[PDB]
Each structure stands twice: as C-alpha cells, then as structure tokens.
From a paper:
[name] is a member of the P4-ATPase flippase family that mediates translocation of phosphatidylserine (PtdSer) across the lipid bilayer. Most P4-ATPases function as a heterodimer consisting of a P4-ATPase as a catalytic subunit and a CDC50 family protein as an accessory subunit. The catalytic subunit comprises a cytosolic region responsible for ATPase hydrolysis and a transmembrane region. The P4-ATPases transport their substrate through a cyclic transition of four cornerstone states, E1–[name]–E2P–E2, according to the Post–Albers-type reaction scheme.
The structure of [name] embedded in DOPS Nanodisc was determined by cryo-EM single-particle analysis. As with the well-studied P2-type ATPases, fluorinated phosphate analogs such as aluminum fluoride (AlF) and beryllium fluoride (BeF) were exploited to stabilize discrete reaction intermediates during the transport cycle. We previously reported cryo-EM structures of detergent-purified [name] in multiple reaction intermediates, including an outward-open and PtdSer-bound E2P state fixed with BeF, and an outward-facing and PtdSer-occluded E2-Pi transition state with AlF. However, to our surprise, structures for the Nanodisc-embedded [name] with AlF and BeF appeared to reflect different reaction intermediates from those obtained in the previous detergent-solubilized samples. The cryo-EM structure of [name]-Nanodisc with AlF was determined at 3.4 Å resolution. In our previous studies using detergent-purified [name], only the [name] state structure was obtained with AlF alone. In contrast, structural features of the [name]-Nanodisc with AlF clearly show it to be entirely in the [name] state, and there is no indication of an E2P-like state in the 3D classification step. The relatively fixed position of the N-domain in Nanodisc may come about through the bilayer interacting with the nearby A-domain, which, in turn, stabilizes the N-domain via the characteristic helix-turn-helix insertion. However, in both [name]-Nanodisc structures in AlF-bound [name] and BeF-bound E2-Pi states, there is no indication of such PtdSer binding at the extracellular site. Our structures of [name] embedded in the lipid membrane, analogous to authentic [name] and E2-Pi, indicate that the membrane boundary varies and is no longer flat around the protein in E2-Pi, a change that likely contributes to phospholipid translocation across the membrane leaflets.
Residue numbers in the entry:
A (entry chain C): 27 to 350
B (entry chain A): 19 to 29, 38 to 432, 454 to 727, 744 to 1091
Amino acid sequence: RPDNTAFKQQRLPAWQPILTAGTVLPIFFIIGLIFIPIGIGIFVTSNNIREIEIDYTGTEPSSPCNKCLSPDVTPCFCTINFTLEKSFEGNVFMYYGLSNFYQNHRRYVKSRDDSQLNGDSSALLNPSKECEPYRRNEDKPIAPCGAIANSMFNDTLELFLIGNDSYPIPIALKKKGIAWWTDKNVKFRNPPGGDNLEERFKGTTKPVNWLKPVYMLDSDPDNNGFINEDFIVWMRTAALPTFRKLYRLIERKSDLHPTLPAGRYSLNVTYNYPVHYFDGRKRMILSTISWMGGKNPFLGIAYIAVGSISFLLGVVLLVINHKY
Amino acid sequence: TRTVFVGNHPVQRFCDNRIVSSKYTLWNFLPKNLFEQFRRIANFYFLIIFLVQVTVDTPTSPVTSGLPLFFVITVTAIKQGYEDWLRHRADNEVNKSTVYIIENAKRVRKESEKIKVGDVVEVQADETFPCDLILLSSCTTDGTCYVTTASLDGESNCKTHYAVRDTIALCTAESIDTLRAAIECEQPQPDLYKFVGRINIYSNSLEAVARSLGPENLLLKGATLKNTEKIYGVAVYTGMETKMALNYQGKSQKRSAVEKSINAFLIVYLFILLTKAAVCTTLKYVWQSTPYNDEPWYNQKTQKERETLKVLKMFTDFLSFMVLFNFIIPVSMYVTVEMQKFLGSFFISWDKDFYDEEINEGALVNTSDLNEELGQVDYVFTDKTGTLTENSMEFIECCIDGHKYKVDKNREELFLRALCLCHTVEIKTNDAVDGATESAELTYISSSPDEIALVKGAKRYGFTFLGNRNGYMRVENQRKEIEEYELLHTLNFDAVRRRMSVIVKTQEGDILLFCKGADSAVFPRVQNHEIELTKVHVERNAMDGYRTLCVAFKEIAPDDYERINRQLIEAKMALQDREEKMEKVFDDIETNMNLIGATAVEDKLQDQAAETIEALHAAGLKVWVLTGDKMETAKSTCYACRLFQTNTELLELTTKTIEESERKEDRLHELLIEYRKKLLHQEYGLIIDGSTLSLILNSSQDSSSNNYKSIFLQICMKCTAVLCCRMAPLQKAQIVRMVKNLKGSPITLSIGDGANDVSMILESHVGIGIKGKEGRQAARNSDYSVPKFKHLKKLLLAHGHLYYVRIAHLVQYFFYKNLCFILPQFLYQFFCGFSQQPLYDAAYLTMYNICFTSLPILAYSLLEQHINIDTLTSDPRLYMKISGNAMLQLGPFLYWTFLAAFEGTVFFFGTYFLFQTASLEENGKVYGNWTFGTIVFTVLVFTVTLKLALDTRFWTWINHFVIWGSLAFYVFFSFFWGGIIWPFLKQQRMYFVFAQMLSSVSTWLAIILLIFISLFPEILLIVLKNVR
Ligand SMILES: *[C@@H]1O[C@H](CO)[C@@H](O)[C@H](O[C@@H]2O[C@H](CO)[C@@H](O)[C@H](O[C@H]3O[C@H](CO)[C@@H](O)[C@H](O)[C@@H]3O)[C@H]2NC(C)=O)[C@H]1NC(C)=O
Ligand SMILES: *[C@@H]1O[C@H](CO)[C@@H](O)[C@H](O)[C@H]1NC(C)=O
Ligand code: ALF
Ligand SMILES: [Mg+2]
C-alpha cells in the first residue's frame, strides 16, 4: 500500500565512497607533490623581487627630516640619501606606508558618503549623517565629507639620481592608473551638470584640514574632482593599522637601460603630514611587481611547509602501513 | 445524570455537534503562535538582540538580525499553520456532512453541525453516524443493525446492535407521533464499551416500562453502518462529549535527549559570547587609556558622543560587542531541526516493511519529536498477551471429570453443551454454500480469543454452535437435531469476578446456569471432592503454558428462576455504578455449582518474537516482561521467547516464597548476598509478583537505612531479564517510572497493545503501541504504532539509529560552523581599535545562515546513511551499542569546538600574513579592508561546505545538488551583489570587491592553501581511523 518509490523507501542510488588507508595515502603523495613544486616557484620568485623602504618620519636628531618634526614653517623640504646596490629591471612601483594609522576603526570607516562621491546632485547639497564630525563647515556642506577625506595624505615625494657628475637627474613619476579601474570610472564620479568643475560645487566648501578645494587637486580635468587618483586611493580604507598605498609608478623605458640603475639617489620630501602625534611612522617604498604581486615569503614558505608535512607524513604512514 | 427527551417536547446546556481539533482558530493564530515560538531560548534571544539594535546605535544595521529572525519565524509559523489547517479541514469534512433529521413530521435535511441533543436522526446505509445515537427502530425485524467500528477500535466485524423493543414498530410509521421517551444517561465517559442508561417511554395508559440501555444499544460516532436499510436514533452526546471525541489525547510524552543536549550546548555558547564581549570591553578601555589611542586627530568624537556619561558608554560598548558577536548562536537551528523532524518522520510511515496484510495498515507516527530517541533506547518493557503472544488461541486436550477424554451419554453431552454454550462467539450469520466444507462456512469471530477456541474445539467433536437467531441458541448435538436454546440472560465477563456465565432455558427442560472462569475463581464454588483430581490436570496444563478455563453448570428450579429473574431485571434498572451492583447481584447466584472439567488452549507466539528478542539483547537492551497473567503461564512463554536460557537460575520473588513479612527482609538480602558472590550476569533471571512488588514499593518506609527498593533495583539492574507477573496497570507504570530516575538517564521503551498498557506507555520515554485485536487505546496514546512486534527490530536498529546520527551530527555542525564564522570577527578586534568594526559586509552576515550554509546540512540530515539500512538490520550485534548518546557528549563536543577554533584562527592569520605583501596583483594595486573580509569569508564558506562533504558517506543526486549548489550560489551571489550600484543601498562598500579579488593569481593560490590547512585535521583523522 505505501508508495514503493526510490526516495520514499530510502533507496536512492548513491555513490557511497569507500575509504581505507589504501585509497587515501595516494592522495597525500599527490598533494605532497603539487604543493612542493609550486612553493619552490613562489618562494624563488619572491626573492627575485628587489624592494627597499625609506623611513623619514624623523623623531631622531640624526634624521635629516627631524628639522621639521615640530611645527616651524609650513613648507618643509628635507632630503634623504639612499643607494641602490641592485638594479631594478622591470617597471617600478612607488608606495607610501603609514604605521599605527587605524584606518579600519569603526568610527573612521563609516565616515564617508558614498552617494555624494558618486555624483548625486541632491546628496551633494546635503551630506549624510555618517560623516557628522566633518559634515558642515561655516554653515556650508563639505564636498568630500567625512574623516577619511579630511585626513588625506598631502606631502610630496620626488626621486633624483646622481651620476658621475654631482648634478641630480629627476625621475619621471607617472600618476595615472594607480587606483582600481572600476571605482575610478564607475564608483567615483563628478557631479552631473556643468562644463567646469568649480561651478558644480556651489554651496559646498573644502574639508577643514585641506588647503585647496576638491575641484582644483589636479590640472588635468580627468583627475580634478572626485576622480583624482591620489584621492581615490586614499578612500580605500586599509585592512590593518600598518599599510602601504600606491603613490606613483615609474614606467619601464623603451631602451635597454633599467628603470632604476644601481647608484645613489635622493628623496625630496615636502613634509606636510603630521604623524608623530599618534606615534605613527611614514615610509617610502620602491618595489618591482612580479606575476604574483609584491615581495612576500609567506606563500612560498607555507607550500613547502604544507607540501613537506603531507609528503613526510604520507611516507611515514606508508612505512607504518607496510611493515604493520 | 442527564435527562433527554426524544422530540424536545413535554412527555439545556448541551454542546453543539461540531468537533474542532484545530489549535488556532483564525485570529489568535499570530498572537498565540508567535508567543509560543518566542518562549524558546534562542528565538527570544534574537528578539532581545533585534530590540537592542533598534533602541541604540549598533555595529550592524537592524537588517542583519531582523531579516534572519523574520524568515525563521515565518517558515516555522507556516509549517505549524499548515498542519493546523489540515486538522481543521479534516474536521470540516465530518462537520459539513448532510444528515437527515425528523424535525417535526418532516424529513428535513440539516448539516451535521446543527444536530442538538434529543432529536430523531435518520441514518441511511453505508454512512457514519453523526453522533452518539441510541438505536430506537430499524427497518428489518428484530431491530438489528450491523455497525462496523473499524475506525474507532480497529474491528471489521459487523457487530449486531439491538434496538429498543417498545419502539420496534416505528419504521417509517410516525416516529414523531408524540414519542414520549425520557432517556436518562450518565455523563459521557471515554470507556467506549460501557454505557449505562434508562429509557422512560409513556404509552396511551399510565405505564413506564423501561429497558436497561447498554453498549448493545449505543451507536457510537464515526462508525460505518452496514447491511441495514435505514436507522432511527436519538442524539444523546453531540460534539466534544461523544466517545469518539473524548479520546483526542496522548501528547504528554515529549522530551528527547538530543533536545536537552541542545540546551546544554546553547548555555555554553552564551557563556562563550559573554566572555568575548567581556574580554573585548576590558581590553578596549585598557587600549583607550592611552590618550592618542582614541581620537588621534584624524577621527574625532562628535560633541554628543564626547559629553556622554562613561558608565553608560561602558554599558553600550558591552552591548555593541554582544551585537557584533551575536551570530555565535545559530538563528536557523530551530527551524532546521523542526523541518528535519517533520520531513524525516514520514520515512517510518512510508516504509513498506511496517506493513501487515491482515490488518491492511502500516505504521503511524503520532509524535515526530522523539525520532532521535529511538536510537537511544536502553530498557524495553514488553506486554505479554497480544504483544509477544498473538491472540490466536487453539483448543487442545479437553478434560471431563479429571479423565482427559480424547458418562458417554450424560456427562459427555453437558460438557460439549457447555462448550457450545456459555459464550458470545457470534458466528458469521451469512454462511456460504454448505458444500464448501463438511457442514457449511462456519467461521467464528468474536472479541474474546479464548471463547473462539472453545467453540472450535467442540466443532472437532460432534457438537457445533449455530446460534444467535432472534435471541435463540442452536447447537447440533451430534445428530440432525437443531436443539434450540432460549437465552434468557447472559452474565458478562469482568476482571473482578474473573468468570462469565449464561442463563438459558432448555427447550424441553429446566433452567440452567453454565459458568466458566479460571481455576482460582470457580473452584471455591464447586464441590471439594471433584477438585483434587481436576487441580493436578489444571496444574500440568498451566505449568506447560496452556491457559485453563474451568466449566461448571447449575440446575435452577422454576421457583428459583423467578426470584432470580425479578432480581436481575430490578438490578438493571438502577443507575449510579450499575456494574459494581452487577458484580454482586449475580455473584451470589453462582455459589453452589457442579464442576464438569477444565480445558487447555494454546497462545502461539508472534512471527519472529524469538528472533526479535535475540537481536534486542545483541543490541545491548535489557528486556523486561511486565504482564498481568499467571506466573506459570507467563514463565513458559519466556522460555519459548528465548528470554530465559536453560542454565538460568530463577530467583522467584513470588507470593508462595514470600508468605511471611519478615521473610521478605531476609530473602531480599540473600540475593544481594548470592549475586554479589558472582560479582566478587546472564546466568540469573528474576521473577516478580504484583503482590510482592506492591510491598516493596509501598511497605518501604519501615526500612530507612536498608532501603528495600534500592536493594531491589540493584538486583534487577544486573540480571538477564526480569519477568513480572500478575501486575495491575498502575504497577506497570511504577516499574517504568522507577527505572527512569536512576544512575543518569536510562532511556526506556514500553510496548503494549491494550488498556492495561496505556499507563506504562505514557510514562516511558518512548511509547510503542501495537495494533492488536484488543483495541486501539494503546495505539492512540503511543508515540509510534506498529502492526506486529517483529517490527520493533526495524524501528530501533535501522530507523532509530539513522534518526539519531543525522540529528546528532546536525546539532554539532551548527555550533561548529558558527564558531568558525565569528572567530575571525573576534580576532579582528585586536587589529582594530576594539571599535566593534565588523570584518564582513552586512550582506554576508545576513546571508550566511539562511542561504550560503543552510541547505547542504538540511539535505544531509534527511538523506545520509553512514551505514546502509540493509546492513544495520542484518548486523545488530554492535551498532546499536556504539551510540549510547556518544555522538553528543563532552568528548566529541570538544573536538568540534577545538576544530572550529583552529580553523577560525587559520582563516584570519592566514589572510593576515597574506596582506604583508603590499600588492597582490601584477598591476601593483592595493586591497582595502573589505577585500580582507571577503578573502576570510570565501575561505570560510568553502571550508564549512567541504567539511560536510567529507562527512557524507551517502552521495545521492540531492547531496551533489545542494553541496555543489551552495558553493555555486555563493560565487554567483557575490558577483551579482558586486556588479551594480543600487540606488536604495547607501553603503556601496562592496561595489567590485569580489571580482577584483579573483583578478589576482596570488589570492587564488592563497585561498586554496587555507582551505587545505583548515581541512587537514579532518582528512588526517579519517586516515588514522584507517590505521587499525
Ligand atoms: C595635510 O593634511 C593634514 C590632515 O589633517 C593636515 O594636518 C595638514 O596641516 C593643516 O594645514 C591646513 C591648511 O589649510 C590647516 O587647515 C590645518 O590647520 C588647522 O589646525 C590648527 C592647529 O594648529 C588650528 O589652528 C585650526 O584648526 C586649523 O584649521 C593644518 N592641520 C594641522 C593640525 O597641522 C595638511 N597640510 C597641508 C594642507 O599641506
Ligand atoms: C628639492 O629639490 C632640490 C633640487 O632642485 C633638491 O636638491 C633639494 O634637496 C630639495 N629642496 C628644494 C626645494 O630645493
Ligand atoms: F495481558 Al497484558 F498488558 F495485555 F498484561
Ligand atoms: Mg493486552
């Protein structure tokens, strides 16, 4: 009387794998023979990357940039000397790093109005309440409201090369293409109506900590307001307190001469960002990016650690299985 | 005592004929269903959390706790609202049925709801009665109608109901012609077999002739009329007072060991959450003590937040951490458990194994909440008659005057006459062609199985019963003589008197009184000299496991009969406990009787009762037989059922051994002395009498230091099988209740088939009710019902084992996959400013429990056979013994929590060390804090889904569809949720995070590694299980 179907009688045809030591040990060797060659490749390709960092926050008498730690004059120009003992072959990337800068703080992360930065006419005139401590200035809305835009990195770094002659050779630093493609061309847009930016921002002022308004960050109209590469990069809130963000990029030259030949260099810093208040640190990083990214030994070491422990354990269990 | 008039006319508070089994009507649905759901710990806890998120500023939007709570409450209410609607509809069909009523000289049609008490109801053939009617008139002569009560008490016999004699000639002839009749019935009782009443008809003169109305006149509600033209009856009980609706109970046995282990797991996870919220808060204010740690000039507190009280800030900070870590309590565990029980319950009923051809019925499930308890049984308490021994009695070895006939014209005839009379066997009247058998189609079917054997035993000899013809009895006396007998009276068998009798007028002679009964009841009535030879014949049959019934007659003179007749009809008149006054009015009638001889009948065991018990012992269950029959008769069956092996020593705590009060004190202690010598097991078995047991349990206050029952339990707990004989239904409950509360939680299962077993079925952890011939009382009050006893092997070893494993793994997996989910969000607080910053987007927090990881575990808990269902029943020796709640103890609980903590740490610090790279792409781009959250989440989802893939041993196509469908849904939904800028959404924080994550090769390699490291202890564990 009860329905005699496969499902109702708990008799659906099932693969039903069988597991013994004879069918799981071969997997250990295979998994132990694929994570070892990959790890060797990853570990080696990490060491090929040549990367240097320059700390210039000062805080010590010997530091060349300590002359403008305390507020003395608005423009500081401190120079750092460093030498490259190994040439950088491919295209080189320039980063600036900050320490003890909690960009992942809850109150800091939400301090933005992503509808305003997308080019919404209504939101531009009245920003949201999430950016409240930096919402209105002098009874006028702030065009990039929020703590994220307010604390933008604003000191200039420059690269110089010293040859046989004592004269410095400036290095051309490119600025385009340092932010994600999508958020620059889709997520971050200027307000809709207008021919020139200064007219689109009528009732909106500049952030309190800024010097120049948002509609004059760059001379190019393609990086002027809300689409400035240096601005868009700073919005992407860092995951950890210690982070590095893309500043510029020195493209590889057409000729065979390397991008950064081995020699002495000078770092021209227009010191403007004060971080000694919260015991932070400022760094400049020149790196060459491989197919996997930057210089990180974690992936290489981890595969060797995982690859060997699977092979070492697989052999021992095979040894125990064989004799016993 | 109620008075009912037939036509509500001269010769108040009565319920309407409208039964409702629904819980919720229409409007109290939401107020009551929601209130019942929010009485649970987890359902109420997410109500507090939702209010907290609304009343104060919290790390996540109220959607993250409002949407998951709204979904589970809705689905749970829909499931419960669905069943309540089905119950209401089933009542709607009964209530919205057209019934024909003689309102006033008219055959008007009214719905079955409109029937009141005291109105003439006309019932046509093949239709169930709308209410409890008293047979007043029938179409055919003798006023007999055949009623099938198969839907009430599972009997397909066409029971012959008799109408009122004074109203016999009212068939379609002015049944409304001012029918003066005041019926006085007792208040409704759920007896279903006992009806006491008294009609009061008034004729043209001043007369008040009144018949005793018994169960022979009551046509119960919900019974199908058969083989009768039409019926006139009077409604007496209409709705919620009917004997059909008074048996709507059997639900107070609902609590499982897994359900209470959920609360034990849920208390721990609340204290883990309290610790995390306390640890972070105390570390937050240690961290914030540094003046530049908080407000370091880039994010500055608003003036409202800066000037608020610190005590309130500390409290709100603690609450913010509770909201942040609330997802450690599974929101969808109740709904998934409830659906698993509801859907997985059908597998018992759908099973073709639990199918009996004779009954045409399968297994029926009354309580789905105890499915996991069938895989935890430890004690089995079994009824004897009907459960272990089917009620198919066979006549063997008749005895006359202690001579064992196997006198020839005088004593020989009386015994066969007494065998062919003094019964209610009620042969099938519609016999077929006589040429089919030796005489005709003479199938005998009746209520009592012993009386069927006796009549069939006479049929083996010349005499044959062919009676029941308009109150007449016909027996063939080895010749062509019809030999009619006029049945003047009949004395119904009752448990008090332990005997039944009839009073019959001889067609050409004096009045007789044939009497049956057990030896212990009839022998005092019979002469002493006859006993000495008959008793030994009874003892040998009784010892050999044959049920014995002694038969005696009594000559009644007409002068004696007249005084008896006046005594009998006077006693039938009275209400107010007639049956007890019955018990005395004819106990004194049968005092001096002449014994003829005893008899023997066989009670054959069920199909595989010996094999079923052999498997139950092999599974590690202690089987006790609680019975209410004689000791020596039950003792023989226990040897037959292989319950006692031959070498077993029988420690008899019977009444013959314990005759003295102080003997019990010594004789109870020597077994503890005797057995402990064996203990410094399966060689000793115990027998208990009901009289002895009552002394142990009641007369136990006399011994305080040497507690009687404590010593008694010590003996029982280490014996083979404790037979318990001559026990009243109350004593059956006491034994079950005694076992439950000792040395932890011994799960008890009681199986029975009669009203003597309802007491113990309700008390035990699991109640199994066999659909026997005795009735449906045991089935109605049971959690599960089976048609045979041999189905207990399949129910416990196959279904019970599978039900437990599926839900013991489901429960452990919910707490595992939620601890893995929150642990990264807790470790992130150290690398944040203890600011209650969520690691994941609000999209992932909501979707994790209800979409990403909700279906693969549900399909697992319904379609997972870690061991095949065929190998489970075929090999019971070990597998039932493996899981004594082992899958949900302190041992395996620490393994899941430690595995969750290990995997939770690998997710975070695997990705934490990955973001030291400063760029994971060939393009040099950098990743934010939302790409950090999605790397951790993507590894998390892929791990918990693949961890479940390793635990599956039964890969159906549904298992592939949900396990690989949930991973494919996560990837698609991440792409969809990260491809368009919605206008309504304000965060826009996840615009293109997932797609940019997959652009890099390093993250593809990083994700693969972290999944393998997280799953390493799980893979490694099964390999060590392959080693030995
Ligand atoms: C670069 O960006 C950081 C981010 O805050 C600034 O601290 C830094 O200096 C600021 O220079 C701008 C010039 O417009 C001033 O608005 C700031 O000043 C404010 O703070 C002083 C404290 O002495 C107060 O009198 C008052 O609030 C001023 O508005 C100044 N910030 C500080 C604290 O030094 C930026 N430098 C640039 C723009 O190059
Ligand atoms: C930056 O530029 C000059 C070169 O013109 C460099 O020598 C010096 O250290 C820096 N300071 C300034 C502004 O001269
Ligand atoms: F014979 Al029983 F319970 F059915 F004792
Ligand atoms: Mg019974």
